[PDB]
RNA sequence: CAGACCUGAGUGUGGCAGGACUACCCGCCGAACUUAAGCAUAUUACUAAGCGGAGGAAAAGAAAACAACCGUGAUUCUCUCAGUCAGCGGCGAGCGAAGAGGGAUCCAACUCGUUGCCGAAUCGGUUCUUAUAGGAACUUGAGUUGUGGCAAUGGUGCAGGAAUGGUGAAA
RNA sequence: ACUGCUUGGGAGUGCAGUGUCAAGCUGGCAGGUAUGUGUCUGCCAAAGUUAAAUACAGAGUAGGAAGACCGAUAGCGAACAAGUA
RNA sequence: UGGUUGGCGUAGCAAAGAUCUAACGGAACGUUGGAUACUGGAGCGGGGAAGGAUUUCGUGCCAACGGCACUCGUACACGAGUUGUUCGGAUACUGAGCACAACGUUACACCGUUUUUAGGAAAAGGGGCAACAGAGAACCUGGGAUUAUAUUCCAAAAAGAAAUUGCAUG
RNA sequence: UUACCGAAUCUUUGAACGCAAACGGCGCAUGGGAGAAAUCCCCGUGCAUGCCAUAUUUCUCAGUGUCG
């Protein structure tokens, strides 16, 4: 099945149609054992074949400039809330005064003998 | 009569092929519980009013 | 003749199956569902009948995606690159 | 220069505005399995007519195009029915130039 | 009058909202049965149902607080205060707390507006640095019908840990 | 002020409606019996955020620990293809 | 709540006139022939709506069910079966009506108007729905074509004959 | 095969959102496909409303609003 991944796009597509054309013929035979084994090989090719496209659209939209333009099926789904929540990038923001009054009095470590 | 939305025909079609005796070989499995189908339907009795 | 002879007088349907709930509760003449309250967006839900709230709440079905997102929150949404 | 009793909003300019195999429908999804009942065996020999359970959402023109591709043969007509069971069933009649018998046996039937 | 602004549209663009859940929680709504040996105020109950909303809790919270002390010091909670020689009440049935005190928690506090001193220092977008940096250049784009400051981090790298799992004893 | 609900809150606990509508040059609010007045005490409202201790009283997700509990007419309606027939 | 009981092999199974015969079948009611009646065209007729939804058909079956019996069944099991350019429906009418939008009201839209204090044209009065009996609506017969479908199937002499829609073609 | 989890797949719907809906109906636009003497046919994607932002190369406009 590693061999199934070495195949290029059309080499998969050609490898795929011969499965469907042969999966169909088992269905003809059925009306009158390998059908499962075929059906799951077709699923392997769509797995490998649907991966190269998502792996090549993450490639098209790689880089900050286009990452906002990414198809959202490819955009990192979390939960609706993890996405709408403030990111640490904007969560940990503190007003400039606070920023200074935290540097001026850092949580200095201490002990009491 | 003739009239059926296909959605209703798909449902009576659903209940129709669902209206079958349990396979013989299912009863022969280990730990099997099922004997008769408990959801056999008959048009003259239970009504699938669609 | 309010009994068995007037049972023959009744011929229609008040309710067909709903497009949402699938209940035979879609009042065809008032195109709405008595059960889900459909086509209204918010589904019908009353606290005086929790036996019915319970009956059709989440987990009553496949929870088809919710199983996926639950597994993910448990795994910190761990991801392959 | 308005000449209607009531105002109407002006035309304003308006700017014009992942599966590797997006088309999931297919000759192989359309046609499923040939049917081998004896009403259908009456048609292959007597009517030059292959019978198929075929995808229920498929239409007739798609079933022609699918027979043309799966079994390499023209379908002079394809009158489908959807079975009480819910499967769709096409009786496809072949062109006289194509035998429905030579083809069905070629098909393993 | 060309534009300008103000007001308002139309598309394009990028987003969000709507649903579910709703035990708990926040807002409104709001009964009656019951009890009073009747019953209307009362009680049930500021409950149920109803509507609307959150979150992992919520709400509350940093004094327009208590006290009246040798004074305490946000909120929540808890034990108690206290079924009260408080109080409400056909002063009837009934209802009914708060301060203090012990404790839990707590290195718990902050931010605006304003005032004063400045006055675009701001923001958005674009590019950029291995970065939609708290960086930089650039932008009329927003913004002086007032952003912001003053006083009253991002990028990249290594590791360990912890935690989960995986493995693993006697006879 | 009036009204209405509300509260133990009692010549008003909170609120709402409507009318009215301040002060900050003896300020304002609280000081649990109204009023006018004088002292004193604490506070500084009408903008905002904020963990923990708390709820889970018919929720969920993923786990776990239990029981002087029930023991198949019991325990959940459901020990079973149960919110199923 | 479950089971069981006497009554009790009882009360009944008495509405719509009805069967008879032979042959065969079968382990023993059906099938055919004949006889005999009945329905009596507002039919125990032939098609449809609603409704039902596999009851259809064939083979088998008759354990259970068909309140007697069954060899038979609308029962059981298995396998089949419903074919459309023209039928009906939608595509494509409007109607009593309904209601999205907007707007308004409401503590709240799950209300109301049904156009909107309203800029609704995207290449004067927004959008939609609502009739299988209204409007609309291009197809007919023959068949030797089925176990079961036919105005749907038929095959090149299409049994055939049409009409009709779209595009294109001389 | 079992267990788990990253990659996907996830049909019709449903808040359901292109318009409808007892219709497996119908669009407009975009790309694809088959195909075919184009018409038809399948497919993908977009296309609801409201609101906020923006027009970053600063969109097009409307007002006997204000001026110039
Ligand atoms: Mg009946
Ligand atoms: Mg029906
Ligand atoms: Mg009555
Ligand atoms: Mg009537
Ligand atoms: Mg048809
Ligand atoms: Mg909601
Ligand atoms: Mg009483
Ligand atoms: Mg309630
Ligand atoms: Mg909070
Ligand atoms: Mg708060
Ligand atoms: Mg305190
Ligand atoms: Mg009380
Ligand atoms: Mg400022
Ligand atoms: Mg009260
Ligand atoms: Mg103040
Ligand atoms: Mg039990
Ligand atoms: Mg007797
Ligand atoms: Mg007669
Ligand atoms: Mg029969
Ligand atoms: Mg049966
Ligand atoms: Mg009308
Ligand atoms: Mg219509
Ligand atoms: Mg008509
Ligand atoms: Mg017609
Ligand atoms: Mg017939
Ligand atoms: Mg839709
Ligand atoms: Zn419904």
Phi-psi region of B5 (alpha: psi -120 to 50; beta: other; left: phi over 0): beta
How far is it, in rounded angstroms, from Cα B46 to Cα D109?
41
User: Sign of the CA dihedral D18, D19, D20, D21?
Assistant: negative
Asked if the Cβ of residue C67 lies within 7 A of any atom of strand E, the reply is no
Q: Exposure string (b/e) for D30-61, b if CB count within 10 Å is 16 or more? A: bbbbbbeeeebeebbeeebbbbbbbbbebeee
Q: Which nucleotide is nearest to D79 (CA to C1')?
A: G83
Asked if the Cβ of residue C13 lies within 7 A of any atom of strand H, the reply is yes
Q: How was this one solved?
A: cryo-EM
State the nearest residue by CA to the C1' of H61. Answer: D12
The C1' atom of H57 and the CA atom of A81 lie apart, in whole Å, by 36
For B1-50, where are the alpha helices, taking DSSP H only? 6-17
Q: Are C46 and C52 in contact (CB under 8 A)?
A: yes
How far is it, in rounded angstroms, from Cα D81 to Cα D78?
10
How far is it, in rounded angstroms, from Cα C29 to Cα C12?
11
State the nearest residue by CA to the C1' of E130. Answer: A63
User: Sign of the CA dihedral A82, A85, A87, A91?
Assistant: negative
For chain C, where are the alpha helices, taking DSSP H only? 50-56, 66-74
Strand F: which positions are within 7 A of a protein CB?
58-62, 77, 80-85
3-state DSSP call for residue C33?
A: strand
How far is it, in rounded angstroms, from Cα B14 to Cα B35?
22
Q: Are A85 and A42 in contact (CB under 8 A)?
A: no
Strand H: which positions are within 7 A of a protein CB?
5-10, 13-17, 21-25, 31-36, 40-44, 59-63
Note if the bond before A18 is cis, omega within 30 degrees.
no
How far is it, in rounded angstroms, from Cα D81 to Cα D52?
10
Of B47, B49, B42, give the one whose Cα is nearest residue B21: B42
How far is it, in rounded angstroms, from Cα A4 to Cα A52?
12
How far is it, in rounded angstroms, from Cα C39 to Cα C30?
11
How many CB atoms sit inside 10 A of residue A10's CB? 9
How far is it, in rounded angstroms, from Cα C16 to Cα C33?
9
Neighbour order of strands in the sheet with D49-54: D31-34, D49-54, D88-94, D75-82
3-state DSSP call for residue A73?
A: coil
Put simply, the answer to whether D84 touches B13 (Cβ < 8 Å) is yes
Phi/psi of residue A108, each to 5°? Answer: -65, 140
3-state SS record for chain D: CCCCCCCCCCCCCCCCCCCCCCCCCCHHHHEEEECCCHHHHHHHHHCCEEEEEECCCCCHHHHHHHHHHHCCCCEEEEEEEECCCCCEEEEEEECCCCCHHHHHHHCCC
How far is it, in rounded angstroms, from Cα A58 to Cα A75?
9
Q: Name residues whose C-beta falls within 8 Å of residue D73's C-beta, 6 or more positions apart in sequence.
A: D67, D94, D95, D98, D103
Q: Name residues whose C-beta falls within 8 Å of residue C47's C-beta, 6 or more positions apart in sequence.
A: C53
Asked if the Cβ of residue A69 lies within 7 A of any atom of strand E, the reply is yes
User: Sign of the CA dihedral D67, D69, D71, D74?
Assistant: positive
DSSP-derived letter for residue A87 is: P
Residues facing D92 on adjacent strands: D50, D78
Asked if the Cβ of residue B46 lies within 7 A of any atom of strand F, the reply is yes
| Chain A neighbors (3+ CB pairs < 8 Å) | C, D
Which chain B positions have a beta carbon within 8 Å of D82's beta carbon? 6, 9
User: Sign of the CA dihedral A18, A20, A23, A25?
Assistant: negative
Which chain D positions have a beta carbon within 8 Å of B12's beta carbon? 84
Residues facing D78 on adjacent strands: D92
How far is it, in rounded angstroms, from Cα D95 to Cα D46?
13
Name residues 46-85 of chain D with a Cβ under 7 Å from nucleic strand H: 56-57, 59, 61-62, 65, 68-69, 82
Q: Is B50 annotated as a binding residue?
A: yes
Of D82, D63, D81, D80, give the one whose Cα is nearest residue D25: D63
* Chains C and B are in contact, defined as 3 or more C-beta pairs closer than 8 angstroms: yes
Q: Are D34 and D107 in contact (CB under 8 A)?
A: yes
Breaks after residues in chain A, judged by C–N over 2.5 Å: 32
């Amino acid at each position: 099945i590693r061999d199934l991944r070495d195949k290029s796009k059309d080499e998969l597509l050609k490898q795929l149609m011969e499965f469907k054309k042969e999966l169909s013929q088992l269905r003809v035979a059925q009306q009158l054992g390998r059908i499962r084994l075929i059906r799951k090989s077709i699923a392997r090719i769509l797995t490998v074949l649907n991966r190269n496209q998502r792996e090549s659209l993450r490639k098209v939209y790689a880089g900050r400039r286009l990452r906002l333009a990414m198809p959202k099926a490819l955009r990192p789904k979390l939960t609706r809330r993890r996405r709408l929540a403030l990111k640490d990038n904007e969560k940990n923001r503190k007003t400039r005064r606070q920023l200074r009054m935290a540097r001026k009095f850092p949580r200095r470590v201490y002990a009491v003998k | 009569g003739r009239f059926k939305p296909l959605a209703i025909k798909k449902k009576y079609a659903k209940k129709l092929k669902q209206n079958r005796p349990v396979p013989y070989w299912i009863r022969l499995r280990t730990g099997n519980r099922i004997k008769w189908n408990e959801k056999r339907r008959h048009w003259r009795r239970t009504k699938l009013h669609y | 003749t309010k009994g068995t002879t007037s049972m023959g007088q009744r011929h229609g349907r008040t309710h067909i199956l709903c497009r949402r709930c699938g209940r035979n509760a879609y009042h065809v003449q008032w195109e709405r569902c008595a059960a889900c309250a459909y086509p209204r967006a918010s589904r019908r839900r009353y606290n005086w009948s929790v036996k019915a709230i319970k009956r059709r709440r989440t987990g009553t079905g496949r929870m088809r995606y919710l199983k996926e997102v639950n597994r993910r929150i448990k795994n910190h949404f761990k991801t392959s690159l | 220069a308005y000449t209607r009793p009531q105002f109407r909003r002006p035309h304003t300019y308006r700017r014009p505005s992942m599966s590797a195999i997006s088309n999931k429908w297919d000759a192989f999804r359309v046609i499923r399995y040939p049917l081998t009942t004896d009403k259908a065996m009456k048609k292959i020999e007597e009517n030059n007519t292959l019978t198929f359970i075929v995808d229920s959402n498929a239409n007739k023109t798609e079933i022609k195009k699918a027979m043309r591709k799966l079994y390499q043969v023209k379908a002079v007509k394809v009158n489908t029915l959807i079975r009480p069971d819910g499967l769709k069933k096409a009786y496809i009649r072949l062109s006289a130039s194509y035998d429905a018998l030579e083809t069905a046996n070629k098909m393993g039937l």
